[PDB]
Amino acid sequence: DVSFRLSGADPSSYGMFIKDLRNALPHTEKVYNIPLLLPSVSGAGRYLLMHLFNYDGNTITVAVDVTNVYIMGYLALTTSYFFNEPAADLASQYVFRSARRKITLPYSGNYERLQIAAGKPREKIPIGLPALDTAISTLLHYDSTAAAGALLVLIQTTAEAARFKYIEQQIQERAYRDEVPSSATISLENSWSGLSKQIQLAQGNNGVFRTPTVLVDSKGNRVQITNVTSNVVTSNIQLLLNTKNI
Ligand SMILES: C[n+]1cn([C@@H]2O[C@H](COP(=O)(O)OP(=O)(O)O)[C@@H](O)[C@H]2O)c2nc(N)[nH]c(=O)c21
Ligand SMILES: *[C@@H]1O[C@H](CO)[C@@H](O)[C@H](O)[C@H]1NC(C)=O
């Protein structure tokens, strides 16, 4: 399991949690020095449990698929909540079985679905460590509209940060003040599957992407990523979704 406490959290302790999260995901291979997530894992071992504590010390446990860093569901006191999707229903067979009751949330884990439930795109939702404290608090008591926004915060501040060092840095900058994600942050989240695929296809193509990935940069400019020498590949990306899952 991995854990993160909001009480006394700073850029350093958050960085430790994101390091722990990445290190908890198994890999047998690196591709261009980036860990390659497994094609699949059997049984309960497919799921990592993240123990998150809000500032008051209340806690949720979040179940994450170790093959793709997808959040499947979470446990809050004696109630489990899972996304309305086959993968999460499958997860519910393995985690939080001791919950007194299981609620299936009225949406899948998809960004598009979550944003419609929440009533806003994530361009408009501040993120940061204070937002993560709120999100844990919200998830503690069922409210499906509020939970969509909380889950948008949770997914980006955990999974997306694990995936991209840039996104981790954006959250560290937001340790004590929330701010909507940069255009670059949104771009990277949206491109993780694409990047993961092209980095793996580069392996037999002399480091060259079969298809260029379009991203927005730090100054908010649209750039073409064509090969593994790009900073996105050498510095930024920390985990590759296996092409078997693309
Ligand atoms: C497509 N899929 C992607 N996610 C992740 O949760 C958010 C998925 O939403 P998305 O809109 O599919 O993401 P993307 O367009 O950025 O790939 C991203 O972090 C995805 O990595 C997903 N999470 C769950 N729980 N279930 C899914 O089927 C699923
Ligand atoms: C590789 O990418 C760099 C910029 O990241 C660029 O200068 C170069 O033209 C690219 N090479 C190819 C063959 O795509």
Automatic annotation (TrEMBL):
Binding site for N-acetyl-alpha-D-glucosamine: I71, Y111, R163
Residues holding cytidine: Y70, I71, E85, Y111, E160, R163
Residues bound to GMP: Y70, I71, E85, Y111
Sequence positions that bind CTP: Y70, I71, E85, N110, Y111, E112, R122, E160, R163
PANTHER family with a match to the protein in the record: PTHR33453, RIBOSOME-INACTIVATING PROTEIN
UniProt binding sites for beta-D-fructose: G109, Y111, R163
Family: Belongs to the ribosome-inactivating protein family. Type 1 RIP subfamily.
Residues bound to CDP: Y70, I71, E85, N110, Y111, E112, R163
Keywords: Hydrolase, Nucleotide-binding, Plant defense, Protein synthesis inhibitor, Toxin
Residues engaged in binding UDP: V69, Y111, R163
Highest rank taxon of the organism: Eukaryota
GO molecular function terms noted in the UniProt entry: nucleotide binding; rRNA N-glycosylase activity; toxin activity
Keyword Nucleotide-binding part of the UniProt annotation: yes
Binding site for adenine 1: Y70, I71, G109
Name of the top EC class for this enzyme: hydrolase
Residues noted as binding UTP in the record, renumbered to the chain: V69, I71, Y111, E160, R163
Residues binding L-ascorbate: I71, G109, Y111
Residues bearing attached sugar chains per UniProt: N227
The EC number(s) this enzyme carries: 3.2.2.22
Binding residue positions for guanine: I71, G109, E160, R163
Binding, CMP: Y70, I71, E85, Y111, E112, R163
Positions bound to adenine 2: I71, G109
Name this polypeptide is given: rRNA N-glycosylase
Bilayer-crossing regions: none
